[PDB]
CSV table of C-alpha atoms in Angstrom, one decimal:
chain,number,residue,atom,x,y,z
A,1,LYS,CA,1.6,-42.9,-44.9
A,2,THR,CA,3.6,-43.9,-48.1
A,3,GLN,CA,3.0,-44.4,-51.8
A,4,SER,CA,3.3,-47.7,-53.5
A,5,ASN,CA,6.7,-48.5,-55.0
A,6,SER,CA,7.7,-48.1,-58.7
A,7,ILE,CA,7.6,-51.6,-59.8
A,8,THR,CA,8.4,-52.3,-63.4
A,9,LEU,CA,5.5,-53.3,-65.6
A,10,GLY,CA,5.9,-56.9,-66.9
A,11,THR,CA,7.3,-58.3,-63.7
A,12,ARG,CA,6.0,-61.8,-63.0
A,13,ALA,CA,3.6,-62.4,-60.1
A,14,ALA,CA,5.7,-64.1,-57.3
A,15,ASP,CA,4.3,-67.5,-56.1
A,16,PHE,CA,3.1,-67.9,-52.5
A,17,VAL,CA,1.4,-70.3,-50.2
A,18,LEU,CA,-0.8,-68.5,-47.7
A,19,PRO,CA,-3.7,-69.5,-45.4
A,20,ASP,CA,-7.3,-68.1,-45.0
A,21,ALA,CA,-8.9,-67.9,-41.5
A,22,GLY,CA,-10.2,-71.4,-41.9
A,23,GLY,CA,-6.7,-72.8,-42.6
A,24,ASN,CA,-7.3,-73.4,-46.4
A,25,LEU,CA,-4.1,-72.8,-48.3
A,26,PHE,CA,-3.8,-70.9,-51.6
A,27,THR,CA,-1.0,-70.6,-54.2
A,28,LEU,CA,-1.0,-69.0,-57.7
A,29,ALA,CA,-2.0,-72.4,-59.1
A,30,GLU,CA,-5.4,-72.0,-57.4
A,31,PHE,CA,-6.2,-69.0,-59.7
A,32,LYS,CA,-4.7,-70.4,-62.9
A,33,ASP,CA,-7.9,-70.5,-64.9
A,34,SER,CA,-8.7,-66.7,-64.4
A,35,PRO,CA,-7.2,-64.6,-67.2
A,36,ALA,CA,-6.9,-61.6,-64.8
A,37,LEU,CA,-5.5,-61.8,-61.3
A,38,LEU,CA,-5.5,-59.0,-58.8
A,39,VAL,CA,-3.2,-59.3,-55.7
A,40,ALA,CA,-4.2,-56.7,-53.1
A,41,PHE,CA,-2.3,-55.9,-49.9
A,42,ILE,CA,-4.8,-54.5,-47.5
A,43,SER,CA,-5.4,-54.1,-43.7
A,44,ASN,CA,-8.4,-54.4,-41.3
A,45,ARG,CA,-8.0,-50.9,-39.8
A,46,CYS,CA,-5.9,-48.6,-42.2
A,47,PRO,CA,-8.2,-45.5,-43.1
A,48,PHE,CA,-7.2,-45.8,-46.7
A,49,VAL,CA,-8.5,-49.3,-46.9
A,50,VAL,CA,-11.6,-48.5,-44.7
A,51,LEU,CA,-12.5,-45.9,-47.4
A,52,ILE,CA,-12.7,-48.5,-50.2
A,53,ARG,CA,-13.7,-51.7,-48.4
A,54,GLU,CA,-17.4,-51.8,-49.5
A,55,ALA,CA,-16.3,-50.9,-53.0
A,56,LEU,CA,-13.7,-53.6,-53.2
A,57,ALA,CA,-16.1,-56.3,-52.1
A,58,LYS,CA,-18.6,-54.9,-54.8
A,59,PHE,CA,-15.8,-54.8,-57.4
A,60,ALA,CA,-14.6,-58.3,-56.8
A,61,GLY,CA,-18.2,-59.6,-56.9
A,62,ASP,CA,-19.0,-57.7,-60.0
A,63,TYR,CA,-16.2,-59.5,-61.9
A,64,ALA,CA,-16.5,-62.9,-60.3
A,65,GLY,CA,-17.4,-65.1,-63.3
A,66,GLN,CA,-16.0,-62.6,-65.9
A,67,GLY,CA,-12.5,-63.9,-65.5
A,68,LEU,CA,-11.0,-61.8,-62.7
A,69,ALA,CA,-9.5,-63.6,-59.6
A,70,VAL,CA,-8.9,-61.4,-56.6
A,71,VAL,CA,-6.6,-62.3,-53.7
A,72,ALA,CA,-6.2,-60.1,-50.7
A,73,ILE,CA,-3.3,-60.4,-48.3
A,74,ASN,CA,-2.8,-58.8,-44.9
A,75,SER,CA,0.9,-58.7,-44.2
A,76,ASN,CA,0.8,-56.4,-41.2
A,77,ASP,CA,2.5,-57.5,-37.9
A,78,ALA,CA,-0.3,-58.6,-35.8
A,79,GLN,CA,1.7,-58.7,-32.5
A,80,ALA,CA,2.2,-54.9,-32.9
A,81,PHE,CA,-1.3,-54.5,-34.4
A,82,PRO,CA,-3.8,-57.0,-32.9
A,83,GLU,CA,-6.5,-55.9,-35.1
A,84,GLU,CA,-4.5,-57.5,-38.0
A,85,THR,CA,-4.6,-61.2,-36.8
A,86,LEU,CA,-5.7,-64.0,-39.1
A,87,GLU,CA,-8.7,-64.3,-36.8
A,88,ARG,CA,-9.6,-60.7,-37.4
A,89,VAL,CA,-9.0,-61.2,-41.1
A,90,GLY,CA,-11.7,-63.9,-40.9
A,91,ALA,CA,-14.1,-61.6,-39.0
A,92,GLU,CA,-13.4,-58.9,-41.8
A,93,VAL,CA,-14.5,-61.3,-44.5
A,94,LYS,CA,-17.9,-62.0,-42.8
A,95,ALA,CA,-18.5,-58.4,-41.7
A,96,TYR,CA,-17.8,-56.8,-45.2
A,97,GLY,CA,-19.0,-59.7,-47.4
A,98,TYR,CA,-15.6,-60.3,-49.1
A,99,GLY,CA,-16.2,-63.0,-51.8
A,100,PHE,CA,-12.4,-63.3,-52.6
A,101,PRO,CA,-9.9,-65.1,-50.5
A,102,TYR,CA,-8.4,-62.8,-47.8
A,103,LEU,CA,-5.2,-64.4,-46.5
A,104,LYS,CA,-2.6,-63.8,-43.8
A,105,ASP,CA,1.1,-63.3,-44.7
A,106,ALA,CA,2.6,-63.8,-41.2
A,107,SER,CA,6.2,-63.9,-42.2
A,108,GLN,CA,5.8,-60.9,-44.6
A,109,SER,CA,7.9,-62.9,-47.2
A,110,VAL,CA,5.1,-62.4,-49.8
A,111,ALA,CA,4.7,-58.6,-49.2
A,112,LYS,CA,8.5,-58.5,-49.7
A,113,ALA,CA,8.6,-60.6,-52.8
A,114,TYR,CA,5.8,-58.4,-54.5
A,115,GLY,CA,7.5,-55.2,-53.2
A,116,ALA,CA,4.3,-54.0,-51.5
A,117,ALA,CA,4.9,-50.8,-49.4
A,118,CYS,CA,1.5,-49.7,-48.2
A,119,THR,CA,-2.2,-50.7,-47.8
A,120,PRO,CA,-4.0,-50.8,-50.1
A,121,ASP,CA,-1.4,-51.8,-52.8
A,122,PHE,CA,-2.9,-53.3,-55.9
A,123,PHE,CA,-1.1,-55.4,-58.5
A,124,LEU,CA,-3.0,-56.6,-61.5
A,125,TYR,CA,-1.6,-59.5,-63.7
A,126,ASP,CA,-2.7,-60.8,-67.1
A,127,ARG,CA,-3.1,-64.3,-68.5
A,128,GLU,CA,0.7,-65.0,-68.3
A,129,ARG,CA,0.9,-63.4,-64.9
A,130,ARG,CA,2.8,-60.4,-66.0
A,131,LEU,CA,2.2,-57.1,-64.1
A,132,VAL,CA,0.0,-54.8,-66.2
A,133,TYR,CA,-1.3,-52.3,-63.6
A,134,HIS,CA,0.1,-51.2,-60.3
A,135,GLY,CA,-1.5,-48.2,-58.6
A,136,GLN,CA,-4.6,-46.6,-57.1
A,137,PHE,CA,-8.1,-48.2,-57.0
A,138,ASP,CA,-9.3,-44.7,-58.1
A,139,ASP,CA,-8.8,-41.0,-57.2
A,140,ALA,CA,-10.7,-41.2,-53.8
A,141,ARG,CA,-8.8,-40.5,-50.6
A,142,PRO,CA,-10.1,-40.2,-47.0
A,143,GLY,CA,-11.6,-36.6,-46.7
A,144,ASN,CA,-11.0,-35.6,-50.4
A,145,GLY,CA,-14.7,-35.7,-51.3
A,146,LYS,CA,-14.4,-37.9,-54.4
A,147,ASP,CA,-16.8,-40.9,-54.8
A,148,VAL,CA,-15.2,-44.4,-54.4
A,149,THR,CA,-15.8,-45.9,-57.8
A,150,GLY,CA,-12.9,-48.2,-58.4
A,151,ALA,CA,-12.8,-46.7,-62.0
A,152,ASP,CA,-8.9,-46.9,-62.5
A,153,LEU,CA,-8.8,-50.6,-61.5
A,154,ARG,CA,-12.1,-51.3,-63.3
A,155,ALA,CA,-10.8,-49.8,-66.5
A,156,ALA,CA,-7.5,-51.9,-66.2
A,157,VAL,CA,-9.4,-55.1,-65.6
A,158,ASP,CA,-11.8,-54.4,-68.6
A,159,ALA,CA,-8.8,-53.8,-70.8
A,160,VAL,CA,-7.1,-57.1,-69.7
A,161,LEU,CA,-10.3,-59.1,-70.0
A,162,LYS,CA,-10.9,-57.7,-73.5
A,163,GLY,CA,-7.3,-58.4,-74.5
A,164,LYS,CA,-6.5,-54.7,-74.8
A,165,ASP,CA,-3.7,-52.4,-73.5
A,166,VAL,CA,-4.0,-51.0,-70.0
A,167,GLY,CA,-3.9,-47.2,-69.9
A,168,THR,CA,-0.3,-45.8,-69.3
A,169,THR,CA,-1.3,-43.3,-66.5
A,170,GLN,CA,-1.0,-45.3,-63.4
A,171,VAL,CA,-1.2,-43.1,-60.2
A,172,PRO,CA,0.6,-44.7,-57.3
A,173,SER,CA,-1.7,-45.8,-54.4
A,174,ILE,CA,-1.3,-44.1,-51.0
A,175,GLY,CA,-1.9,-45.7,-47.7
A,176,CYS,CA,-0.5,-46.7,-44.3
A,177,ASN,CA,2.9,-48.3,-44.5
A,178,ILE,CA,2.9,-52.1,-44.2
A,179,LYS,CA,3.6,-52.7,-40.6
A,180,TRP,CA,6.9,-54.6,-41.0
A,181,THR,CA,7.9,-56.7,-37.9
A,182,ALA,CA,11.0,-55.1,-36.2
A,183,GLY,CA,13.6,-56.5,-38.5
């Protein structure tokens, strides 16, 4: 278990090229027309991601067409954790109804460029792809009793889409560490 890193607000979204489980490739240019862009480092089996998985698919669907693009990335080492393969990532999409692209970062170069530390780790960018929110989906944690609402991220997306300032309280997310390959 670890907290997300303190990443300075304003940092530019790093570019990537990453595949989905059909082999389609995605870069930042594929999301260019969406004024808000969420990049989410998640996992197929981490309990902190299991907690919000239904909510995340609902959240992304709710905003599809309102100007939010969501990209999810699984950077976990799938030799060490076979449940994290690209093939499994493809099965997660169908099983949980993910409308957003869910991509595999096999070399972990993208997780390293964003400075992701745990799953889930959420980075929200504005129209010029500057970081405006980095933190928890909401206050829910496995076993803490709180409803999974996505309210912190929702409030941040709403602010971006309405051209307003994101709130300054950003609680770090908590999850399983990214499973870095030995070295």
